[PDB]
Symmetry: D2
Subunit: 395 residues, 4 copies
């Protein structure tokens, strides 16, 4: 049987296979022991560890019993049929590029708010999660930090998912603006250029769950994010929220400018929308969570590590079409010239990279360059591209 | 042997295979009898037709003798190992979208020069050539017309190929401008935004074959185009050249603006460069030739139907990175929002589409919309995308 | 004596002069019987009318007694030594131009707020007050209406008067912007272009009476206006204030944009400043009052009909230097091309004209042209200039 | 008689008046012995000096005979009825401000052409000519230099004089642009913003003497200038012309941009117009000549020191209306904020100031500030204004 073949493959001319050997073999591929799809499996393993004082041998019966629950993924993992059969070498490349980026330095930690002028210019972490389930971490992959501007794609995806492409783009545009992200101006028919610049994001946040009050909207968006992050750590930075809402005069200017030109749906309180925008900008994340959200955007709109649907394919396709052409603002043309990937960046450090049909990635470094892009993150991106050949127009 | 297997496959329980049957079978796949790689083959067939008064039977020997010369491609063609195993159904889809675009109409034939105000608003043709050798035509696929603006990618590719990415982009920029293609303004460090807008193309044409006189430059570029078109019809529209050079005040303004800011290499005659630019804009093409050039840009920088190298991979990669983000100018964001492909358009009708690693395409229709894009061409592009799922961020 | 000479001049070979004859003669010149400088005089006349049942004759004594109080102005008025010796003919010209402007029509009454979409497109009034004391009215010269944008020069004058030119212009610029009045952008060193565009006025309103709360600021500015209007009707349009503060999204956008770039003094509440700005924009006026304020701006910074000082000469000079070059916004160049005068215009109808060293004028008409300038007001201005030769560069 | 009264006034209780005493007395007022209106007079004086070996006494007859010819101006000059009765004190003020400006220094002599990178950064001269005939000089008031940009008002005046305001302004605009003088962009209805920016001047030079060839146009304009300069030194800088025509890429860009949008009259050769523009820009002048041309612009369109008519009043009025609002380009708002006068400036050093109804002035200094305005010239202008109170909105 297939289970017997798997048992023989795990073993090497032996009778019994210890549990720890199987756990190490499973973790070798890239999947984590905490994977929800494997939950039942591990539970049974615990039921096996409750009897023996130390160690247990699984020859024929117990192994089959533990592997019986949802025996689909294990066959693929041990048969190397995922999108990246070898994750151990790509991980080594992550480590090499990580050290290489660490060697460089020199920027200016954002100080427009005190909570941002609080991180030492030394935190530098990376996390990656494949569309299939593999995950890797290196460094500060559990420290908290605000998403800041990494959430705008997530706003757009949800809005067009709820309403659909046609209704939404009656309100925001479709084109790169060619200028900075915080510039006050609209396209030819007095509409936001795209939902990645701040004005487009401010108009977009007003299409989500219209009518109900901000508490219900935040509950809705947090629910969507939690099933986007795959039930990972998505939090709230109340200190950062309080700082941002007081140092966000540019966003208030953009919001009133939009409201004046009738860029909003019928019957909207603009100020509540701005407060909601700041709330979403103030969602704390760890490179693990932001990487998982990236992979969700990358996969199909589904979540990678839960086998779940979160967005309609049109929403995700449009979000990537907008991230590739506006993800890095007026620098995007250069980024896609060298990197050729959809990516987003937050002033609080952090780059969210999507390799469509491959993986998602988040890499965090507080100190900023003059553009607003973490030096080590940009360096990691360029080196990753040079060594892995991930440009969208590579051969 | 392999030849015997091919002969049996062609035959149906018979002894001899007539020549016409084999010719029809070969043309069925998509390859043309005039393919250079098959030249020798067809020559031998003619040597076979010089003996018999009418018809000849090839059982074992003559078929093997004719197929011996370069027996690599035939095995793939009869084994359906190309990039599009079935070209007969895609051709039917081309026909359907062709008729659908023909049904629509309504524009304004360009009249800024008389030679353009000379085509009846009824010519509507399409041609496609796969990276492997397949070709299809429908309609006015041999009438002449000027490339106009479809040549700017071809200028950039050649320039960076001769000099390399690093030296060239010291002169032109890398970003979408966000405005029309004929606007006079440069990027932050007083450099052209990109080589697709007119200013970037005018600066780029001055990097090709520096020093020598315009006659030698035109011979050089025509040589490159001829081995880009695959030795197809690349001509010159002397009447159109004379009209354009007299109705090109915008390009002269851009050229002098560039020369003033020191956007040119050392020691360049600007006016000669502008005349050279108009000469390249005045290169006559038929949807066959422009399609072949598109497929060259699509393949690797190699020519599809000659197995030849014309450009370095860096040149082609950069040219596609610039066509996807500036190929349709300030409308490109919308085009890549719906079509998701590198494409270029000329005021003389004609859209050049590249499906990287798949094919190139040229579709010609004189009458223009307000943007400057042929109505039927734009409609064909959108319908092609909707029915074939060729968007770069499709699943 | 001088009084005897005046009495003989008033009389025509007679002994006694009736009071009504003298009153008519005085009103003929242009001065009003309610002039504060003449107050005492008229009071004595009333004391003379309390004795006789009807009519009283003033031969030598009573006339001298009544004229004794401040006998300076009367000598000039009866000696024709004012700036316009004949005010009866200029008044006829006002009437002619008034009817001529009335004949034309056709606009669009402002409807962005209901209080403005409340005047019938038929109100058309004019008032003029000379720097010396003469006043003329024609039509709706006592109906109320909001100043709207006619107050910005008055804000700038007061600000620079309190602080001085040097300190103030450290905050706002000095140049025409060349664009509309409600555009969001600053000059080269991120400062407002000038205090006439909305952004400059919003920054300027924050320099007046810094520190204290909005109630004290409004009391201060109303005091200044009342001694600017010459203790005429300066009111408040609470209904219009409530409408404006709810339909002023453009001004809120400008205000937040200014606050973001650090265009404000140290320690300012921006929102309170915006509310104060709307309060000043909502000050009701009648062509009499706005004309008197214009004449104040025209005279020296002094009030015309009270012999009082309200502004330092530097403040007034700078205010006129800014009204001539930015008073009508991006149309000002054309206005000064044909009219050659400092002028301001409000969306609520009303044009405030200053003929420096000559007079001030206010002309009210609700319906607007596409620019934002009342049709009849613009027509009156152009005709006034054509017939009176008041262009600043006339001979 | 009047002549006897003048003779007695010149004398001091004496019988005879020597010629040299009268010449000194005449030169004291400010008029020059070379004044054309006095020509005949001086001729007779020479006829008087041909008889006596040395010195001649004029008691009654010879003085009357010499003064008989056109005895109008002398009465005014000796009766102090000109516009500036005392020219000796204003001259002292010129000297004081001249030294004060000389004390400052520091710029960058223009080096875009070698002929401009040829003057030592030490030449500093001033000349003034009153509307009535007075003239004063201080320093390099006879060295040659090119007008450069001081000619654009002179082009506009002549164009609108020949054709009239209405026809001309169908081609150029009326508004300040708010940007630099060499920017490529047009107003709302695709027309030049005004005839002071380079584009407006290039369109304006094509309205003068249409149809005929460039030689006839240059003869026409030189004739007009010569009767504008009052038959003073107006020359041509052939070396500077040859340098400019080769370093004028910005003007060529502007010219082609204009021709493209149909901003020219019917049937014009654009390149000939550009060559004509450079020719007019290359007209050599000495502070004497440019001052005389300024005074012509200041007087009425008439020439000051010839009693001649050169321009229609509408032309001059419009030229001043455009110089006050666009004379110093994007700095004009600040200039009129502090100086309040029509003024023009050339990159070759030289400021041309008009005090309407008072005088014209030219002050030359090669080295430039960053704006393009000679440091010493700007300093002289500001100090002149501060000490003389010539601001247009002064009291």
């Amino acid at each position: 049987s297939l289970e017997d073949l798997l048992f023989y493959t795990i073993a090497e001319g032996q009778e019994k296979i210890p549990v720890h050997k199987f756990i190490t073999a499973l973790k070798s591929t890239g999947l984590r022991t905490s994977d929800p799809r494997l939950k039942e499996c591990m539970d049974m393993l615990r039921l096996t560890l409750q009897t023996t004082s130390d160690g247990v041998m699984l020859d024929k019966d117990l192994f089959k019993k533990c592997v019986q629950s949802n025996i689909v993924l294990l066959t693929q993992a041990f048969r190397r049929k995922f999108v990246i059969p070898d994750f151990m070498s790509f991980t080594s490349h992550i480590d090499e590029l990580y050290e290489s980026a660490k060697k460089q330095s020199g920027g200016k930690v954002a100080d427009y708010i005190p909570q941002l002028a609080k991180f030492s210019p030394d935190l530098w972490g990376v996390s990656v999660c494949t569309v299939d389930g593999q995950r890797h971490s290196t460094g500060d992959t559990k420290v908290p930090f605000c998403l800041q501007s990494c959430v705008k794609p997530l706003k757009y995806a949800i809005a067009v998912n709820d309403l659909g492409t046609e209704y939404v783009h009656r309100y925001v545009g479709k084109e790169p603006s060619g200028l900075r992200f915080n510039k006050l101006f609209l396209n030819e028919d007095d509409k936001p250029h795209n939902p990645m610049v701040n004005a487009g994001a401010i108009v977009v946040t007003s299409l989500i769950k219209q009518g109900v009050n901000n508490a219900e909207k935040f509950d809705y968006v947090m629910q969507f994010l939690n099933k986007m992050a795959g039930n990972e750590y998505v939090g709230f930075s109340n200190a950062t929220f309080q700082s941002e809402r007081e140092s966000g005069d540019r966003n208030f200017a953009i919001g009133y400018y939009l409201k004046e030109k009738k860029c909003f749906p019928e019957g909207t309180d603009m100020v509540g929308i701005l407060d909601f925008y700041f709330q979403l900008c103030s969602i704390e994340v760890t490179c693990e969570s932001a990487s998982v959200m990236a992979a969700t955007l990358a996969n199909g709109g589904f979540c990678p590590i839960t086998g779940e649907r979160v967005l309609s394919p049109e929403a995700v396709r449009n979000t990537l079409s907008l991230m590739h052409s506006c993800g890095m603002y007026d620098f995007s043309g250069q980024f896609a010239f060298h990197v050729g990937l959809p990516a987003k960046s937050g002033v609080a450090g952090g780059i969210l990279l999507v390799v469509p049909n491959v993986m998602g990635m988040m890499c965090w470094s507080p100190p900023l360059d003059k553009m607003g892009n973490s030096v080590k993150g940009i360096h990691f991106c360029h080196d990753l591209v040079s060594l892995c050949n991930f440009h969208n127009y590579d051969n």
